[PDB]
Amino acid sequence: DEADEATKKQAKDTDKSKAQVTYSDTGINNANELSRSGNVDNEGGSNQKPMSTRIAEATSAIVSKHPA
Amino acid sequence: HEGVASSSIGKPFMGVPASIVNDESVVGVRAARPISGMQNMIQHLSKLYKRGFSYR
Amino acid sequence: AYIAVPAVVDSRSSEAIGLLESFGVDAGADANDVSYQDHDYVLDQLQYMLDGYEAGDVIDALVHKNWLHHSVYCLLPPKSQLLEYWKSNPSAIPDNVDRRLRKRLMLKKDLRKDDEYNQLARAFKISDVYAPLISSTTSPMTMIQNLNQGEIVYTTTDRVIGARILLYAPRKYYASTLSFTMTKCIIPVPHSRFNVGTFPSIATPKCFVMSGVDIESIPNEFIKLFYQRVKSVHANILNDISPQIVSDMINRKRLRSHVDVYKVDVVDMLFEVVDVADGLRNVSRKLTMHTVPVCILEMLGIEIADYCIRQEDGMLTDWFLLLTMLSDGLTDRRTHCQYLINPSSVPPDVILNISITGFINRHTIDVMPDIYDFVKPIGAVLPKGSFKST
Amino acid sequence: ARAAFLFKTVGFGGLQNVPINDELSSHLLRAGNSPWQLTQFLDWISLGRGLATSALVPTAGSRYYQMSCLLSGTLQIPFRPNHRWGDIRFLRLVWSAPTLDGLVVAPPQVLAQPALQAQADRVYDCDDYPFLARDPRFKHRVYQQLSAVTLLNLTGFGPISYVRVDEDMWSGDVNQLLMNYFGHTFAEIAYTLCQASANRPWEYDGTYARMTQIVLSLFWLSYVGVIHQQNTYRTFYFQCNRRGDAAEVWILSCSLNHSAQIRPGNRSLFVMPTSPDWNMDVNLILSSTLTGCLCSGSQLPLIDNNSVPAVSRNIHGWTGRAGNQLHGFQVRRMVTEFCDRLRRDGVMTQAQQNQVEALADQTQQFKRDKLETWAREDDQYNQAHPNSTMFRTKPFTNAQWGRGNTGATSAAIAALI
Amino acid sequence: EFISSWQNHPIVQVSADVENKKTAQLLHADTPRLVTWDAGLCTSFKIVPIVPAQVPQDVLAYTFFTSSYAIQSPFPEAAVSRIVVHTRWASNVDFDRDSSVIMAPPTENNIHLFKQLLNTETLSVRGANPLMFRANVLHMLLEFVLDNLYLNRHTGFSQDHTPFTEGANLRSLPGPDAEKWYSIMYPTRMGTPNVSKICNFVASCVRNRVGRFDRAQMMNGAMSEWVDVFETSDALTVSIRGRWMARLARMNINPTEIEWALTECAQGYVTVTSPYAPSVNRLMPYRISNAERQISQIIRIMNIGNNATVIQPVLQDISVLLQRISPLQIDPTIISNTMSTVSESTTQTLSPASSILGKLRPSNSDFSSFRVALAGWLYNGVVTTVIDDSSYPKDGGSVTSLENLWDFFILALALPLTTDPCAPVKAFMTLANMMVGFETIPMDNQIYTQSRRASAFSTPHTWPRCFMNIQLISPIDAPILRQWAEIIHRYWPNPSQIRYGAPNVFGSANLFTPPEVLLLPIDHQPANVTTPTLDFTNELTNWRARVCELMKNLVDNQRYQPGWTQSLVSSMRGTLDKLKLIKSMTPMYLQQLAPVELAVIAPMLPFPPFQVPYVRLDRDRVPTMVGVTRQSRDTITQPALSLSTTNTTVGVPLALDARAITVALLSGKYPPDLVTNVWYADAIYPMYADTEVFSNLQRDMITCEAVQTLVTLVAQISETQYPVDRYLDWIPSLRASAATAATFAEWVNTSMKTAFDLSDMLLEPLLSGDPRMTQLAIQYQQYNGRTFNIIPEMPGSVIADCVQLTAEVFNHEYNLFGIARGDIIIGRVQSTHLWSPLAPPPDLVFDRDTPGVHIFGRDCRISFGMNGAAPMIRDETGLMVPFEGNWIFPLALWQMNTRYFNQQFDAWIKTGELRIRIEMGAYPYMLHYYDPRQYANAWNLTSAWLEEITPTSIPSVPFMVPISSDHDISSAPAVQYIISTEYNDRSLFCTNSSSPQTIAGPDKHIPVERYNILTNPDAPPTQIQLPEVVDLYNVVTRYAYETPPITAVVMGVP
Amino acid sequence: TQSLVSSMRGTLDKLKLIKSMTPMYLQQLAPVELAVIAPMLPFPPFQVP
């Protein structure tokens, strides 16, 4: 998606419908490329649930209350 | 309808196009089977043949 | 993030109606997060394609379509008509055209009997000027690949699929059919975080297919075929997510006109027969009852609980009988067979206490019988002993 | 390329018959009647992620030894001079089809007839059997497992592995294939390689054979400790997060920090463990299996006669008058050698070494106790039943629990580089 | 009048009907779903409360218990707790196997679980036939394994911010609620304020085994490849999923191999690329074994037997593909143009050109027959292509007829392209039939004489001796026939071979041929240029020339020419010359290009090629029979000894039209400027983007797995020829038959189809025979009598191995599954003691060796008492004894004499001194808890059980058990009647877990052995104790592997 | 006109290998049933060797 956006921006800058130079759809099989994303946290786990909410879950699991 | 199959799969006739309909003869599963030009034409003729005829 | 659902989706109608709510998705508050694609033109294009080719290869080709990338088809007239259209308004000729042809075309003179223009005319081929050409013989897979890579796909035929078709020349030159639904005028959208469409795709690993509706119960028949073929071929490489998962994805961080009256939402109910003859319990059988409208369920309050379905006299209760009549049948969960209830209290197989468990399949159907075309009397055939008086 | 196809059968560990019986044979053939059970063994060990166990198969080495015993006891029927395949029985079992495809229960007549009395330490030639001689592909497919069995049965210690270093092995195809295993473990690589070898026998100097040799060399160099993250062999090494654990996991890895200098030439040697605790080390058995699969068409160098018992001497394709020496080692001492080499290299500290030592000591204690208990149980069962004597694990002696030539073996492997 | 029997109308659960979708299955098959991910807990056992606690109480103040402070606890806080089996009771799956096994607490009825398969005659709803317990248990275990077949997924972690742990990393579960999971998963995290049993157990554990402890971080800013954690789970499911993962790992392949395989399959006409960089550990399981391929091929051949309609559409599809990718095309007017220039006279009544054009009638659709004839070359094992009988002359024809001459010409050109091995003999006999009367040859008998139709010579036995020995034909009497025979012998096409496929990844499915090899009935010579021109150095062109010159010789014969006008002779000679010199490109195309197209098409066919060797004129080597086997004979155990006589022949002939083939052979042209490499690079590229072969590999793997599982399961209840171990022989079972085996196999088939989400046929080809003796083999035979047979090797089955392991575990943990073991004793016991009936004191139990007992059996007779005497019953020794003492009864005796025995014995059991031991083996049980401070009697329950015993079913055995107490209580009398003969109380978990101790009643602390990892400080972290003990806390490995499609990693250059 | 050898052989093999229980019933149970019902008939059996 970033490559496609770069190509579109290049076309806009060059004032042409299509761009002579493209960052996407080249002849190179660059299929192992990786980019930073918000889906992976610093620990190597997934962010399907926020870290703050996970911490709240863990700390609420051990709460004790005043007797009646 | 069952004999006309094989030799006509997915290809029209008389200007009537092919189509896609439902199948539930097989027990427990009811999926979609594609029919040909003659098969679609027979499918449409069958409801008339099952209901009857109106006569002014 | 593209999510595929087993229903037809349109930009305005699916926004007006609660399609995600109909399937069971929780509310998303502001709707700026989601955007709906329109696939009705794609569906009629699919029917047109099926008229010529086989279903399987067209479906397989359409699987590899990236719905997050824009592209369009450009329909060209036949070769001769293109020559006359270039002879008129001679600014239309591209630079790729031969110099001799271009100069002769500017002749502004009757070129029928010059014979140099004529030998050039036999020599001319459209593929020389335009590289990507469908040419009415191209495979659907090649169509989808050329549509995925690039923006303009030139074609000389109208039997294509995947994108809108734009004319290249005035309608006079084109002698084809007047399929104005897919063909626009001769002269001449960002995606949100979530985009909802009909046809599933495997182009990118950010695509998802929504589960929760059984592939059997899909109302639309073409969508039923598409989903069947996709699931039967690419079963191991599809991302399936529950409606609860979809709702969580929609509301992760935020949470911490004329309307048709013949569309209803139905659910499948799961229950179990329980014998409580003694203080203990004995589970006898597991049953699922199909196609129960939700509005009657809300009216006659039913929750996950234990009920008795017989009265003091010994006959079935009115509410249970009405619910069974409204449903489309009962199936045994272990042995996938139709189940017929015993109306009497004769000891073999008497149901007296039931336990409701949950509801699984939720979708929208049309109550229109589709044969009630003219207003006429109704004659129903029902065998003897069918609680007619009740 | 190999020219002679010979193999050796297991020898009695003090008994008067092959140490296997009907119960063990049925448990082995529980899910498949094919005696060639390499894939079944691979499935049973479950990628070596944990300590596999069972009532009749306490360890992975136990199953390996039982497979060897079953093949040794069963193959002696078609290799009689008359070469008949289906007229006699061995433990209520008969071959199905002359092509040695499976074992089935004997017919009533054969059951009434007496069974075959097998012998110990027999050496056989594959080309003697007419069908094996006729069909080359069948012979090549069988000879992989036959070679693995021979490599296990050659001596009384654990299985034997082959280590070779040669710079000319590397090529473009080898690099391209090797780069694909960047994050996989040794067990997974061995699984894929073994399945590929089973599908197609390799040729003498093929890409798969060269890559297998390279992988074995890398694993053994990393195990000794010559190669690590700060000293790599063409930016490749093996990493183990918990050294001395009961079930160690090794991961292939690349690093751009430093590349060691390799002298030109071709060098090789033969390694084996001596301590009995090899029964609970999947990596060593998998390395031996890879060497056996290689032995199908590679013709490895000869093994010196003085390193093997008398009954294993002068095998046409395996042993010889002047050959390479076998280097044996002990796992617990090799752990200390690994730690010391890393500390001298300067990438480890005293506290880390102490922690590794403590963990290794605990693991050794546990394994020793379990093995002794199982041996005693086997002895008691043999005492109780005098007509169906068996062994569940390869017999060992008390002397094998001490350090042997571990220092010399470590020095030789280090000098390999 | 209360018939109650009409309602008993059974419904058959399996129906059989005529089957035509075998064609659809052969063209396309459903792919099993192998990869499924789980994000919940990897456990199948749960602890449930049975009796609530005793808070508040009059002894201990309420400020003691933690429930008063609302502190969450790992285990239920109750007076009684038990372990119950519930598969996937805590999981988050993306796909549902629907093979779940749920049980109820023992205080409820579970009889419905043991009456699922063959209890179609059990009228009652609370009873089951004790003679199918083994079958029901086997099906239950299979369901257990099938439901537990999943993979573990690595979700995510967070660090602990409380001093309860030393900053450990805790996993987060995806779901609506997580507070309960965070307390269930980690028992050791809880604090220990008081001296309750739970707190003591927690305080007796280590502190440094919780959460994650190992990771594989191979890249920065990316998900870890895998992790290892300590969490609640069970060893059985852990082991099962480990074996499943190992099986998939053995199938994993990498993109470079796929690239190489695709290139080698495409023969260099298509190029694909793969990346070269570090990656993220993809999982693409697609590699299987040649044995599996061969077994699937044999099963498909068995499915397609003797039925043409099942195989014809396959040939049609292949012809469509050939038409799409081939450069050869029909020339419209070549024949008419070449024949419009023959010199003729207009005063003749016969015109050879007009006659030949009328007989030919070219059409564009004629090429379809040619292409299906080409396609038929790959399946000569099951399909034999022949020339339709209508092509031959109606009455045999005559050489005086120009029309018959043209029929002979057409048939002669068309015949050598068929796969029928009798084509040369038919070609000879066509001319023989035409020249009967004109020339004579010696035949064999009076049946197959020279007047018999040429299409009737269809078997090798019918070859005439004069055909095999040319010297018998007289050079003077039959010169034309001798010439034709010599031409046939020295110019028939010679078979050859070509190489195809890339078996490195796809394996090889060849059976009777060496792998990677295709045979061809004509000679193949590779082309050396990419710009072809017309060439006449071909065997087919030579054949045409020889036929034309033979017809010229026949016309120029001096016994035939005088009957014709000179002009007609000249016109015929000119026509023959033009036919000989016609410019057709088809013979050269068939020699240089068609084999390449066949080779590039073959590897991606749904039905792999099945071939037998082509023989030219060697009659001794002609194949005459191809057969497959699926059963075994009386006592024959080795397939090599029963394949010869337990096989069914397969094969079918398919007819074609000679005219279409001849027209295609005579009219063929290339595009004006053709460059073969460019043309094929353009044509083949779209075809090589499909993955159906990759799907078919998985389908074959599942098929073989199912076959092995079926045989393994059937061996447990029947007698088979394969070695197997037994663990459930103590469970009663009936004497099975073929119908029982068929029903059991049908149930297994349905279960596996449901588990793997398949709607088409599976194991039904093998379900048409007695499944007690199954085997798979194939063979074929020659004319001289030699036979060649193939017996595939059977690969292992991870599913079958897992089922056997589950049986081994069940053999020790039967109690957790609701089943009791042993026998029962009925007799009155009255006391105030609080022992449990599931662990009775030894003195109450008596057995066959106990002195004084009376053992009863088959021949029981009861003699009534008279005048105050007592009634007596006959022992097996022969003595008659009164109704008192200790008796031993097999269950079947009471079952067959229920009412009489009840009426004669119930009073003495209730009040007298009679005690009876019923031998049962295995049975389901029920628990009823009673308060120990009040009177209680069990006579009602026992009498109900005894009276509802029936000769075809029994209900669950009821037990009466007291309730444990944690303080002093008074005692009250209690009356018991039923006890077990051995210990059957392994389901207990703890009693009074919230209280410091249990003063009265049965006592049971938390089992430390089930938590060996946490309670034994010097044990390896990855130790399991199967099958004796199932651990409830283990080490679990969770992965994050990716499963992309093939086209996402392998991209081909356009 | 067309060879039917393969079809005939296949049909005959299927008929030979059919899974009928009738011979087993005839040689095992039918004699027992006949012997059971024989002594109760109004017209006792009358047989010739």
Coordinates of N, CA, C and O in Angstrom, one line a residue, chain D residues 212-301:
Chain D
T212 N 22.8 -31.2 2.9 CA 22.8 -32.0 4.1 C 24.1 -32.1 4.8 O 24.2 -31.9 6.1
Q213 N 25.2 -32.2 4.1 CA 26.5 -32.2 4.7 C 26.8 -30.9 5.4 O 27.4 -30.8 6.5
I214 N 26.5 -29.8 4.7 CA 26.7 -28.5 5.3 C 25.9 -28.3 6.6 O 26.4 -27.8 7.5
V215 N 24.7 -28.7 6.6 CA 23.8 -28.6 7.8 C 24.4 -29.4 8.9 O 24.4 -28.9 10.1
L216 N 24.8 -30.6 8.6 CA 25.4 -31.4 9.7 C 26.7 -30.8 10.3 O 26.9 -30.8 11.5
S217 N 27.5 -30.3 9.4 CA 28.8 -29.6 9.8 C 28.4 -28.4 10.7 O 29.0 -28.2 11.8
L218 N 27.5 -27.6 10.3 CA 27.1 -26.4 11.0 C 26.5 -26.8 12.4 O 26.9 -26.2 13.4
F219 N 25.7 -27.8 12.5 CA 25.1 -28.2 13.7 C 26.2 -28.7 14.7 O 26.2 -28.4 15.9
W220 N 27.1 -29.5 14.2 CA 28.2 -30.1 15.1 C 29.1 -29.0 15.5 O 29.6 -29.0 16.7
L221 N 29.5 -28.1 14.7 CA 30.4 -27.0 15.0 C 29.7 -26.1 16.1 O 30.3 -25.7 17.1
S222 N 28.4 -25.8 15.9 CA 27.7 -25.0 16.9 C 27.6 -25.8 18.3 O 27.7 -25.2 19.3
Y223 N 27.3 -27.1 18.2 CA 27.2 -27.9 19.4 C 28.5 -27.9 20.2 O 28.5 -27.8 21.4
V224 N 29.7 -28.0 19.5 CA 30.9 -27.9 20.2 C 31.2 -26.5 20.7 O 31.6 -26.3 21.9
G225 N 30.9 -25.5 20.0 CA 31.0 -24.1 20.4 C 32.0 -23.3 19.7 O 32.3 -22.2 20.1
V226 N 32.6 -23.9 18.6 CA 33.5 -23.1 17.8 C 32.8 -22.0 17.0 O 33.3 -20.9 16.9
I227 N 31.5 -22.2 16.6 CA 30.8 -21.3 15.8 C 29.6 -20.7 16.7 O 28.9 -21.5 17.3
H228 N 29.5 -19.4 16.8 CA 28.4 -18.8 17.6 C 28.1 -17.5 16.9 O 28.4 -17.2 15.7
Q229 N 27.3 -16.6 17.6 CA 26.8 -15.4 17.0 C 27.9 -14.4 16.6 O 27.9 -13.8 15.6
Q230 N 29.0 -14.3 17.4 CA 30.1 -13.5 17.2 C 31.2 -14.1 16.4 O 32.2 -13.5 16.1
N231 N 31.0 -15.4 15.9 CA 32.0 -16.0 15.1 C 31.2 -17.0 14.2 O 30.9 -18.1 14.7
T232 N 30.8 -16.6 13.0 CA 29.9 -17.4 12.2 C 30.7 -18.0 11.0 O 31.7 -17.6 10.6
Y233 N 30.1 -19.1 10.5 CA 30.6 -19.7 9.3 C 29.8 -19.2 8.1 O 28.7 -19.7 7.8
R234 N 30.3 -18.2 7.4 CA 29.6 -17.6 6.3 C 28.3 -17.0 6.7 O 27.2 -17.2 6.0
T235 N 28.2 -16.4 7.9 CA 27.1 -15.8 8.5 C 25.9 -16.8 8.8 O 24.8 -16.5 8.6
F236 N 26.3 -18.0 9.2 CA 25.3 -19.0 9.6 C 25.8 -19.7 10.9 O 27.0 -20.0 11.1
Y237 N 24.8 -20.0 11.8 CA 25.1 -20.7 13.0 C 23.8 -21.3 13.6 O 22.7 -21.1 13.0
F238 N 24.0 -22.0 14.7 CA 22.8 -22.6 15.4 C 22.8 -22.0 16.8 O 23.8 -21.9 17.5
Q239 N 21.6 -21.6 17.3 CA 21.4 -20.9 18.6 C 20.6 -21.9 19.4 O 19.6 -22.4 19.0
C240 N 21.0 -22.0 20.7 CA 20.2 -22.7 21.7 C 20.1 -21.9 22.9 O 21.1 -21.5 23.6
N241 N 18.8 -21.5 23.3 CA 18.6 -20.6 24.4 C 18.8 -21.2 25.7 O 19.3 -20.6 26.7
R242 N 18.5 -22.5 25.9 CA 18.7 -23.2 27.2 C 19.6 -24.4 27.0 O 19.1 -25.6 26.7
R243 N 20.9 -24.2 27.1 CA 21.8 -25.3 27.0 C 21.8 -26.2 28.3 O 21.7 -25.6 29.4
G244 N 21.9 -27.5 28.1 CA 21.8 -28.4 29.2 C 20.4 -28.8 29.6 O 20.2 -29.5 30.6
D245 N 19.4 -28.3 28.9 CA 18.0 -28.7 29.2 C 17.7 -30.1 28.8 O 18.5 -30.7 28.1
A246 N 16.6 -30.7 29.3 CA 16.2 -32.0 29.0 C 15.9 -32.2 27.5 O 16.3 -33.2 26.9
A247 N 15.2 -31.2 26.9 CA 14.9 -31.2 25.5 C 15.4 -29.9 24.9 O 14.7 -28.9 25.0
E248 N 16.6 -29.9 24.3 CA 17.2 -28.8 23.7 C 16.6 -28.5 22.3 O 16.3 -29.4 21.6
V249 N 16.4 -27.2 22.0 CA 16.0 -26.8 20.7 C 17.0 -25.9 20.1 O 17.5 -24.9 20.7
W250 N 17.4 -26.2 18.9 CA 18.5 -25.5 18.2 C 17.8 -24.8 16.9 O 17.1 -25.5 16.2
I251 N 18.1 -23.5 16.7 CA 17.5 -22.7 15.7 C 18.6 -22.2 14.7 O 19.6 -21.7 15.2
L252 N 18.4 -22.4 13.4 CA 19.3 -21.8 12.5 C 19.2 -20.3 12.5 O 18.1 -19.7 12.8
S253 N 20.3 -19.6 12.3 CA 20.3 -18.1 12.4 C 21.5 -17.6 11.6 O 22.5 -18.3 11.3
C254 N 21.3 -16.3 11.2 CA 22.3 -15.6 10.5 C 22.8 -14.4 11.3 O 22.0 -13.8 12.0
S255 N 24.0 -14.0 11.1 CA 24.6 -12.8 11.8 C 25.6 -12.1 10.9 O 26.4 -12.8 10.3
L256 N 25.6 -10.8 10.9 CA 26.6 -10.1 10.1 C 27.7 -9.5 10.9 O 28.5 -8.7 10.5
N257 N 27.9 -10.0 12.2 CA 28.9 -9.4 13.1 C 30.3 -9.8 12.6 O 31.2 -8.9 12.6
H258 N 30.5 -11.1 12.3 CA 31.9 -11.5 12.0 C 31.8 -12.9 11.3 O 30.8 -13.6 11.5
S259 N 32.7 -13.1 10.4 CA 32.8 -14.4 9.7 C 34.2 -14.9 9.9 O 35.2 -14.3 9.7
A260 N 34.2 -16.2 10.3 CA 35.5 -16.9 10.6 C 36.3 -17.1 9.3 O 35.7 -17.1 8.2
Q261 N 37.6 -17.4 9.4 CA 38.5 -17.7 8.3 C 38.6 -19.2 8.2 O 38.9 -19.9 9.2
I262 N 38.4 -19.8 7.0 CA 38.4 -21.2 6.8 C 39.6 -21.6 5.9 O 39.7 -21.0 4.8
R263 N 40.4 -22.5 6.4 CA 41.5 -23.0 5.6 C 40.9 -23.8 4.4 O 40.0 -24.5 4.5
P264 N 41.5 -23.7 3.2 CA 41.1 -24.5 2.1 C 41.4 -26.0 2.3 O 42.4 -26.3 3.0
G265 N 40.6 -26.8 1.7 CA 40.8 -28.2 1.7 C 39.5 -29.0 2.0 O 38.4 -28.5 1.9
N266 N 39.7 -30.3 2.3 CA 38.6 -31.2 2.6 C 38.9 -32.0 3.8 O 39.9 -32.8 3.8
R267 N 38.1 -31.9 4.9 CA 38.4 -32.7 6.1 C 37.1 -33.3 6.6 O 36.0 -32.8 6.3
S268 N 37.2 -34.4 7.4 CA 36.1 -35.1 7.9 C 36.4 -36.0 9.0 O 37.6 -36.4 9.2
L269 N 35.4 -36.4 9.7 CA 35.6 -37.4 10.8 C 34.3 -38.0 11.3 O 33.2 -37.6 10.7
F270 N 34.3 -38.9 12.3 CA 33.2 -39.6 12.7 C 33.0 -39.5 14.2 O 33.9 -39.7 15.0
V271 N 31.8 -39.1 14.6 CA 31.5 -38.8 16.0 C 30.4 -39.8 16.5 O 29.6 -40.3 15.8
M272 N 30.4 -40.0 17.8 CA 29.4 -40.8 18.5 C 29.4 -40.5 20.0 O 30.4 -40.2 20.6
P273 N 28.2 -40.6 20.6 CA 28.1 -40.5 22.1 C 28.3 -41.9 22.7 O 28.0 -42.9 22.1
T274 N 28.8 -41.9 23.9 CA 29.1 -43.1 24.7 C 28.2 -43.2 25.9 O 27.8 -44.4 26.2
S275 N 27.8 -42.1 26.6 CA 27.0 -42.2 27.7 C 25.6 -42.7 27.3 O 25.1 -42.3 26.3
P276 N 24.9 -43.4 28.2 CA 23.6 -44.0 27.9 C 22.5 -42.9 27.7 O 21.5 -43.2 27.1
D277 N 22.7 -41.7 28.2 CA 21.7 -40.7 28.1 C 21.4 -40.2 26.7 O 20.6 -39.2 26.6
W278 N 22.0 -40.7 25.7 CA 21.7 -40.4 24.3 C 20.3 -40.8 23.9 O 19.8 -40.4 22.9
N279 N 19.7 -41.7 24.7 CA 18.3 -42.2 24.4 C 17.3 -41.1 24.5 O 16.2 -41.2 23.9
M280 N 17.6 -40.0 25.1 CA 16.7 -38.9 25.3 C 17.2 -37.6 24.6 O 17.0 -36.5 25.1
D281 N 17.9 -37.7 23.5 CA 18.4 -36.6 22.7 C 18.0 -36.8 21.3 O 18.6 -37.6 20.5
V282 N 17.0 -36.1 20.8 CA 16.4 -36.3 19.5 C 17.5 -35.8 18.4 O 17.5 -36.4 17.3
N283 N 18.2 -34.8 18.7 CA 19.1 -34.2 17.7 C 20.2 -35.2 17.3 O 20.5 -35.3 16.1
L284 N 20.8 -35.9 18.2 CA 21.8 -36.9 17.8 C 21.2 -38.0 17.0 O 21.9 -38.4 16.0
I285 N 20.1 -38.5 17.3 CA 19.5 -39.6 16.5 C 19.1 -39.1 15.2 O 19.3 -39.8 14.2
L286 N 18.6 -37.9 15.1 CA 18.2 -37.3 13.8 C 19.5 -37.1 12.9 O 19.4 -37.3 11.7
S287 N 20.6 -36.6 13.5 CA 21.8 -36.5 12.8 C 22.3 -37.9 12.2 O 22.7 -38.0 11.1
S288 N 22.2 -38.9 13.0 CA 22.6 -40.2 12.6 C 21.6 -40.7 11.4 O 22.1 -41.3 10.5
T289 N 20.4 -40.4 11.6 CA 19.4 -40.8 10.5 C 19.7 -40.0 9.2 O 19.6 -40.6 8.1
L290 N 20.1 -38.7 9.3 CA 20.5 -38.0 8.1 C 21.8 -38.6 7.5 O 21.8 -38.7 6.3
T291 N 22.7 -39.0 8.3 CA 23.9 -39.7 7.7 C 23.5 -41.0 7.0 O 24.1 -41.3 6.0
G292 N 22.6 -41.7 7.6 CA 22.2 -43.0 7.0 C 21.5 -42.7 5.7 O 21.7 -43.4 4.7
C293 N 20.6 -41.7 5.6 CA 20.0 -41.3 4.4 C 21.0 -40.9 3.3 O 20.9 -41.2 2.1
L294 N 22.1 -40.2 3.8 CA 23.1 -39.8 2.9 C 23.9 -41.1 2.3 O 24.3 -41.1 1.1
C295 N 24.0 -42.1 3.2 CA 24.8 -43.2 2.8 C 24.3 -44.0 1.6 O 24.9 -45.0 1.2
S296 N 23.1 -43.6 1.1 CA 22.5 -44.4 0.0 C 23.4 -44.4 -1.2 O 23.6 -45.4 -1.9
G297 N 23.9 -43.2 -1.6 CA 24.7 -43.1 -2.8 C 25.9 -42.2 -2.7 O 26.3 -41.6 -3.7
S298 N 26.6 -42.2 -1.6 CA 27.7 -41.3 -1.4 C 29.0 -42.0 -1.1 O 30.1 -41.4 -1.4
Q299 N 29.0 -43.2 -0.6 CA 30.2 -44.0 -0.3 C 31.1 -43.2 0.6 O 32.2 -42.7 0.2
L300 N 30.7 -43.0 1.9 CA 31.5 -42.3 2.9 C 32.8 -43.1 3.1 O 32.9 -44.3 2.7
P301 N 33.8 -42.4 3.7 CA 35.1 -43.1 3.9 C 34.9 -44.3 4.9 O 33.9 -44.5 5.5

